[PDB]
Design a protein around this motif. Structure first.
Motif, PDB file in Angstrom:
ATOM      1  N   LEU A 125       0.828  -1.264   0.000  1.00 33.82           N
ATOM      2  CA  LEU A 125       0.000   0.000   0.000  1.00 33.82           C
ATOM      3  C   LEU A 125       0.834   1.273   0.000  1.00 33.82           C
ATOM      4  O   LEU A 125       1.974   1.289   0.438  1.00 33.82           O
ATOM      5  N   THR A 126       0.220   2.353  -0.462  1.00 36.52           N
ATOM      6  CA  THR A 126       0.916   3.631  -0.578  1.00 36.52           C
ATOM      7  C   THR A 126       0.436   4.777   0.311  1.00 36.52           C
ATOM      8  O   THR A 126      -0.466   4.618   1.117  1.00 36.52           O
ATOM      9  N   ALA A 127       1.052   5.945   0.140  1.00 37.14           N
ATOM     10  CA  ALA A 127       0.655   7.108   0.917  1.00 37.14           C
ATOM     11  C   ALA A 127      -0.790   7.507   0.666  1.00 37.14           C
ATOM     12  O   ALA A 127      -1.295   7.378  -0.440  1.00 37.14           O
ATOM     13  N   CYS A 128      -1.461   7.964   1.715  1.00 35.05           N
ATOM     14  CA  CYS A 128      -2.837   8.400   1.600  1.00 35.05           C
ATOM     15  C   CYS A 128      -2.888   9.635   0.726  1.00 35.05           C
ATOM     16  O   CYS A 128      -1.947  10.430   0.698  1.00 35.05           O
ATOM     17  N   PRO A 129      -3.986   9.807  -0.016  1.00 40.77           N
ATOM     18  CA  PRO A 129      -4.061  10.995  -0.871  1.00 40.77           C
ATOM     19  C   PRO A 129      -3.917  12.271  -0.039  1.00 40.77           C
ATOM     20  O   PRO A 129      -4.104  12.242   1.179  1.00 40.77           O
ATOM     21  N   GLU A 130      -3.580  13.386  -0.681  1.00 39.80           N
ATOM     22  CA  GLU A 130      -3.436  14.639   0.060  1.00 39.80           C
ATOM     23  C   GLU A 130      -4.785  15.004   0.691  1.00 39.80           C
ATOM     24  O   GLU A 130      -4.847  15.500   1.819  1.00 39.80           O
ATOM     25  N   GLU A 131      -5.866  14.749  -0.037  1.00 40.83           N
ATOM     26  CA  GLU A 131      -7.196  15.009   0.490  1.00 40.83           C
ATOM     27  C   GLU A 131      -7.938  13.666   0.551  1.00 40.83           C
ATOM     28  O   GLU A 131      -7.908  12.881  -0.399  1.00 40.83           O
ATOM     29  N   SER A 132      -8.587  13.399   1.678  1.00 40.55           N
ATOM     30  CA  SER A 132      -9.301  12.147   1.845  1.00 40.55           C
ATOM     31  C   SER A 132     -10.521  12.047   0.950  1.00 40.55           C
ATOM     32  O   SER A 132     -11.282  12.997   0.810  1.00 40.55           O
ATOM     33  N   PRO A 133     -10.693  10.894   0.293  1.00 43.66           N
ATOM     34  CA  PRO A 133     -11.860  10.735  -0.570  1.00 43.66           C
ATOM     35  C   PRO A 133     -13.096  10.396   0.263  1.00 43.66           C
ATOM     36  O   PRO A 133     -14.171  10.212  -0.279  1.00 43.66           O
ATOM     37  N   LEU A 134     -12.946  10.348   1.585  1.00 41.04           N
ATOM     38  CA  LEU A 134     -14.068  10.017   2.464  1.00 41.04           C
ATOM     39  C   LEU A 134     -14.832  11.214   3.034  1.00 41.04           C
ATOM     40  O   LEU A 134     -15.959  11.061   3.503  1.00 41.04           O
ATOM     41  N   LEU A 135     -14.232  12.403   2.996  1.00 45.89           N
ATOM     42  CA  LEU A 135     -14.879  13.609   3.533  1.00 45.89           C
ATOM     43  C   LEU A 135     -16.321  13.839   3.053  1.00 45.89           C
ATOM     44  O   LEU A 135     -16.626  13.644   1.883  1.00 45.89           O
ATOM     45  N   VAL A 136     -17.198  14.267   3.961  1.00 46.47           N
ATOM     46  CA  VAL A 136     -18.596  14.538   3.629  1.00 46.47           C
ATOM     47  C   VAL A 136     -18.904  16.040   3.666  1.00 46.47           C
ATOM     48  O   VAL A 136     -20.026  16.466   3.378  1.00 46.47           O
ATOM     49  N   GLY A 137     -17.908  16.841   4.029  1.00 48.51           N
ATOM     50  CA  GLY A 137     -18.120  18.275   4.108  1.00 48.51           C
ATOM     51  C   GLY A 137     -18.883  18.629   5.372  1.00 48.51           C
ATOM     52  O   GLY A 137     -18.637  18.032   6.424  1.00 48.51           O
ATOM     53  N   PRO A 138     -19.820  19.590   5.308  1.00 47.90           N
ATOM     54  CA  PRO A 138     -20.600  19.987   6.481  1.00 47.90           C
ATOM     55  C   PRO A 138     -21.344  18.850   7.184  1.00 47.90           C
ATOM     56  O   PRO A 138     -21.686  17.842   6.577  1.00 47.90           O
ATOM     57  N   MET A 139     -21.578  19.028   8.480  1.00 46.16           N
ATOM     58  CA  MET A 139     -22.250  18.030   9.295  1.00 46.16           C
ATOM     59  C   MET A 139     -23.116  18.694  10.363  1.00 46.16           C
ATOM     60  O   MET A 139     -22.814  19.790  10.849  1.00 46.16           O
ATOM     61  N   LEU A 140     -24.188  18.004  10.730  1.00 42.97           N
ATOM     62  CA  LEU A 140     -25.115  18.479  11.740  1.00 42.97           C
ATOM     63  C   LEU A 140     -24.606  18.034  13.112  1.00 42.97           C
ATOM     64  O   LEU A 140     -24.460  16.838  13.383  1.00 42.97           O
ATOM     65  N   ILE A 141     -24.345  19.001  13.980  1.00 42.55           N
ATOM     66  CA  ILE A 141     -23.839  18.715  15.309  1.00 42.55           C
ATOM     67  C   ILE A 141     -24.870  19.070  16.360  1.00 42.55           C
ATOM     68  O   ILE A 141     -25.229  20.238  16.513  1.00 42.55           O
ATOM     69  N   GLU A 142     -25.334  18.061  17.097  1.00 44.31           N
ATOM     70  CA  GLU A 142     -26.328  18.287  18.147  1.00 44.31           C
ATOM     71  C   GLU A 142     -25.982  17.582  19.448  1.00 44.31           C
ATOM     72  O   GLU A 142     -25.379  16.515  19.450  1.00 44.31           O
TER      73      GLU A 142
END
Ligand SMILES: CC(=O)N[C@H]1[C@@H](OP(=O)(O)OP(=O)(O)OC[C@H]2O[C@@H](n3ccc(=O)[nH]c3=O)[C@H](O)[C@@H]2O)O[C@H](CO)[C@H](O)[C@@H]1O
Ligand SMILES: [Ca+2]
Ligand SMILES: [Mn+2]
Lengths: 272, 123
Positions: free
Chosen positions: A1-18
């Motif tokens: 396996l190699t280095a993780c991308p510079e930006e994660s392909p898993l990010l969802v952006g904004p999120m609801l925090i309660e």
């Protein structure tokens, strides 16, 4: 396996925090099977270059912690970080000392792993956008830039409180954080002054990416506004040389490894 | 009540330029002094500071914990815990005329540079 991308392909952006629905850490562990005892996580998919120890000053904030853990473990794994969680618990009932507990965190985390990055976070701050990465950058990083408490806006350009991230070198370069700030306020301004004296500027994500929620709460007894804070802030240049990692002393009373985090209880003395 | 930088800046115009202190400087001082909370109450060491300006009961306002105070401002400290800032401002002016800006410990360290950020553009 190699280095993780510079930006994660898993990010969802904004999120609801309660902070309504109650948290069940057992539920949380169940939903985060990959996190190992002590709250350690290393990506399997790739190799991350960010070995991050997340340090939380703590005393009597168990309910806040549950929420913190409930939201951060998912975010941090999505961010593909090789991280560890550390709750530095102050023993006794003397004046609270946030910065000193953070120094302890730095020292203690290094006993477990070769960390190259340290995120210092209040137990009650939750980031609202996973693009706000909990890792270190070329310059000291201020993470909680737009807190709902301050109306989603940085209170002043020199503000460094809440959540911040310093690489091992950045931290070493300023002799760490001050140990002499007892009670509430000023320690973050002292740290800001040290970074500047050592010729560093503060890196921050813009205010949309940097939105964070702070659980609402009253002030804690034993952590009342420190009357000497403003005078102390005016001398950082001379005191940082003698009050920091190089003068840190404390006693470890207990080390607890929970599946979601490591809780280190320490005796850090009293206002000298 | 926790006010905004602009609410404060608009309420303290009569103090603008007084003793040489500008509105930007006050916006900066008040944030660090009370976080713009008109109800802030902080004990120091045998004394208590009240309101937006954190006026102390040691010499300036009369409290019930210290009735013998000089009460230089001639006002009950409880009058410094509401949203009507005219009496807070009048007392602050006396502090400035008598003791000076140094009464506010945050001025020097926090408000000596980067003053432009404290400007309120809201009319
Ligand atoms: C988001 C924000 O505004 N953060 C800053 C602000 O926090 P706050 O005014 O919110 O004060 P606070 O009461 O949350 O103290 C900061 C942190 O200390 C911890 N704590 C404190 C007291 C206690 O009894 N138990 C305990 O665990 C906990 O992680 C807490 O979040 O001002 C402090 C001033 O000193 C720090 O600079 C914080 O970084
Ligand atoms: Ca009033
Ligand atoms: Mn808080």
């Amino acid at each position: 396996l190699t280095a993780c991308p510079e930006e994660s392909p898993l990010l969802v952006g904004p999120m609801l925090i309660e902070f309504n629905i109650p948290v069940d850490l057992k539920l949380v562990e169940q939903q985060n099977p990959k996190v190992k005892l002590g709250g350690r996580y290393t990506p399997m998919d790739c190799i991350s270059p960010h070995k991050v120890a997340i340090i939380i000053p703590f005393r009597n904030r168990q309910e806040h912690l549950k929420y913190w853990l409930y939201y951060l473990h998912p975010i941090l794994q999505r961010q593909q970080l090789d991280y560890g969680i550390y709750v530095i618990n102050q023993a006794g009932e003397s004046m609270f000392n946030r910065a000193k507990l953070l120094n302890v965190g730095f020292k203690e985390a290094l006993k477990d792993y070769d960390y190259n990055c340290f995120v210092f976070s209040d137990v009650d701050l939750i980031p609202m956008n996973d693009h706000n990465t909990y890792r270190c950058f070329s310059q000291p990083r201020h993470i909680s830039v737009a807190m709902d408490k301050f109306g989603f806006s940085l209170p002043y350009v020199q503000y460094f409180g809440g959540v911040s991230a310093l690489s091992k070198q950045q931290f070493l370069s300023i002799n760490g954080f001050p140990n002499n700030y007892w009670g509430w306020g000023g320690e973050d301004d002292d740290i800001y002054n040290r970074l500047a004296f050592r010729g560093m500027s503060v890196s921050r994500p813009n205010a949309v990416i940097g939105k964070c929620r702070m659980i609402r709460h009253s002030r804690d007894k034993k952590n009342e506004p420190n009357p000497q804070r403003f005078d102390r802030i005016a001398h950082t240049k001379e005191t940082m040389l003698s009050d920091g990692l190089n003068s840190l002393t404390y006693m470890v009373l207990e080390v607890q490894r929970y599946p979601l985090y490591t809780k280190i209880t320490v005796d850090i003395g009293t206002p000298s | 009540t926790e006010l905004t930088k602009c609410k404060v800046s608009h309420a303290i115009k009569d103090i603008d330029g007084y003793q040489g202190i500008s509105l930007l400087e006050w916006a900066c001082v008040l944030f660090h002094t009370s976080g713009y909370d008109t109800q802030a109450v902080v004990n120091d060491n045998g004394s208590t500071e009240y309101g937006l300006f954190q006026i102390s009961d040691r010499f300036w306002c009369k409290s019930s914990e210290f009735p013998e105070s000089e009460n230089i401002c001639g006002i009950s400290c409880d009058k410094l815990l509401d949203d009507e800032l005219d009496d807070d401002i009048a007392c602050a002016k006396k502090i400035l005329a008598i003791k000076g800006i140094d009464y506010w410990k945050a001025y020097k360290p926090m408000c000596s540079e980067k003053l432009e950020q404290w400007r309120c553009e809201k009319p």
